[PDB]
């Protein structure tokens, strides 16, 4: 139809506003973790020790001293997120129409939205061994990190377990580009004010979804609707991610939230 | 309200990211 | 193409829910629980009727009823409620109004599902084929554990998304859109679902009180 | 239990 040009315009442009705002692409991280590049660095941290030796190999950067480990890591979790969100908010004011969203809305749709992109970009950045942190400087094993005490040795297994899944689509860039700016304009975020200007960009959005996935995975049947079901998965990891913080908060001496991430979890489901 | 509950994310929504 | 036909599940919805229910002339969670164990029963008999599922291996049939039972029936009521002022409407004739909601220490997940799923609903005017559809998508979850054979319940999720797809080309053809905003009701159905079994373990466990309990 | 039951009917 004669709507098709401008949906592949939209694409394209989403595309290129991806590359701007997100440093490492999946399509870097692939050539990073099957060892493809030749700049390719990453130190392994799969132990107490390795951690030691590439713990400095490790942004905004100071030595806030005597934390154990699995807190550490667990905050530079939350570290990583800080600047995500500032990516994913650059990315957000890319696509047409959000800018011109009532405010309130805006910071609503970034206040559900940013935990459900971070962990789909995640996805990027693993495989089933591992993650990729520090853009692509590190790689830290996936049984590290299911090795720590208690409860941080399983937060990460229901990403990594997503991942899996979510990996087996075989999305690129372009495609995750629209993905995540479907997820972005959700209308069903609570306390929207104004529900129907978001819905109808999201629409167009998954118009010009449904038409990439048709063109680049022209033999992958259903991917559209199989790729809309993940925003259900994703939607669970973050409300079981939001209830492991409840507990730790109530339990863990006073490990203190970076202040965004603060403000994104108060009052988050 | 809820903009003054996300100072923050207001900034970034309407300035941008300080360097 | 309609190896899994819209007409089948369209049947195995309309064989629940009759107009007698006026009324017989409050406590909203065991007015609501019992509306459930109710409903648990006729589940079964509407599982049957959606097609493939009784081909498929007992013990599969059995877990995935037991994953999804608990999103299958809060679809079911909700879009039953499409036109109710603030409550829903049980299978069991009764209203749940909000106040008693709230009185009764469940306001915040009961205006979650008002706000997003019955409103949503009502606003698409989704129909009962299309509320089938989503009902058997939920149903074929190939990821539930034990699992004999999860890839021929993929493959059935798949055929439910094909049909449902075509369905809403012909009926709707001035809605390209529609079929993914039926998808986009799914993931407020799973946050609403997993926060309805919390307070079910909750009221399992103080004695708050059949085959909702063998479910639990 | 009755799950079983009510499925083989
Ligand atoms: C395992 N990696 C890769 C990043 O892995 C992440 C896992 C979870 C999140 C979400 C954060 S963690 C939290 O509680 N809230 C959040 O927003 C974000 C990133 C790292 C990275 C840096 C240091 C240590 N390890
Ligand atoms: C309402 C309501 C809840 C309902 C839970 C479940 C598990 C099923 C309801 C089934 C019905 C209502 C079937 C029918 O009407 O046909 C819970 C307890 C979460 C919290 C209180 C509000």
């Known amino acids: 139809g004669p709507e098709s040009a401008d949906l592949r315009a939209l694409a394209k442009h989403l595309y290129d506003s991806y590359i701007k705002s997100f440093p490492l692409t999946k399509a870097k991280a692939r050539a990073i973790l099957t060892g493809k590049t030749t ?70 749709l970034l206040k559900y939205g940013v935990h459900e992109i971070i ?65 972005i304009l959700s209308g069903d975020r609570p306390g929207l ?9 999201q629409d167009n959005l998954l118009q010009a979804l449904e038409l990439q996935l048709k063109l680049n995975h022209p033999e992958s049947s259903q991917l559209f609707a199989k790729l809309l079901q993940k925003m259900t998965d994703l939607r669970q990891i973050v409300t079981e991610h939001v209830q492991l913080l409840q507990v730790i908060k109530k339990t863990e001496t006073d490990m203190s939230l970076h202040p965004l991430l603060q403000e994104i979890y108060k009052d988050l489901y | 309200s809820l903009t003054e509950r996300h100072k923050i994310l207001h900034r970034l929504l309407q300035e941008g990211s300080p360097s | 193409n309609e190896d899994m036909p819209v007409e ?81 409407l049980l299978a069991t004739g009764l209203h749940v109004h909000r106040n008693s909601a709230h009185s009764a220490g469940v306001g915040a997940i009961f205006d979650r599902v008002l706000t997003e799923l019955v409103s949503k609903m009502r606003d698409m005017q989704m129909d009962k084929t299309e509320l089938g559809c989503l009902r058997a998508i939920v149903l074929f979850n190939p990821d539930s554990k034990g699992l004999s ?23 709707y053809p001035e809605q390209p859109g529609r079929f993914a905003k039926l998808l986009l009701r799914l993931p407020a159905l799973r946050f609403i679902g997993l926060k309805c079994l919390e307070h079910l373990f909750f009221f399992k466990l103080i004695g708050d009180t059949t085959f909702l309990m063998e479910m639990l």
């Not at chain 3, 319940?153 to 049909?163: D, G």
Request: glycine share 4%.
């Open chain 3, 8 to 88: 089948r599940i369209l049947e195995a919805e309309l064989a629940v829910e009759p107009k007698t229910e006026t009324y017989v002339e409050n406590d909203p969670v065991t007015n609501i629980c019992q509306a459930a164990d109710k409903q648990l029963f006729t589940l079964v008999e509407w599982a049957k009727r959606i097609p493939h599922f009784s081909e498929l291996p007992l013990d599969d049939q059995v877990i995935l009823l037991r994953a999804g039972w608990n999103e299958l029936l809060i679809a079911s009521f909700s879009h039953r409620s499409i036109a109710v002022k603030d409550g829903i």
């Open chain 3, 149 to 171: 054979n999860p890839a021929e319940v993929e493959a059935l999720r798949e055929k439910v998304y094909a049909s449902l797809e075509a369905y809403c080309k012909h009926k």
């Open chain 1, 119 to 183: 962990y789909t970009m995640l996805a990027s950045l693993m495989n089933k061994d591992g993650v990729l942190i520090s853009e692509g400087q590190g790689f830290m094993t996936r049984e590290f990190l299911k090795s720590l005490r208690k409860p941080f040795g399983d937060f990460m297994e229901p990403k990594f377990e997503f991942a899996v899944k979510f990996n087996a689509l075989e999305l690129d860039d372009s495609d995750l580009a629209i993905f995540i700016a479907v997820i």
């Open chain 1, 193 to 201: 004010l104004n529900v129907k200007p978001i819905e109808d960009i």
């Open chain 1, 39 to 108: 700049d390719k660095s990453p130190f392994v941290i799969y132990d107490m020790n390795s951690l030691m030796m590439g713990e400095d190999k490790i942004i905004t950067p100071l030595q806030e001293q005597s934390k154990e480990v699995a807190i550490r890591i667990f905050q530079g979790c939350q570290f990583r997120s800080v600047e995500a969100v500032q990516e994913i908010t650059e990315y957000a004011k890319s696509i047409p129409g959000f800018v011109n969203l009532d405010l309130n809305d805006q910071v609503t």
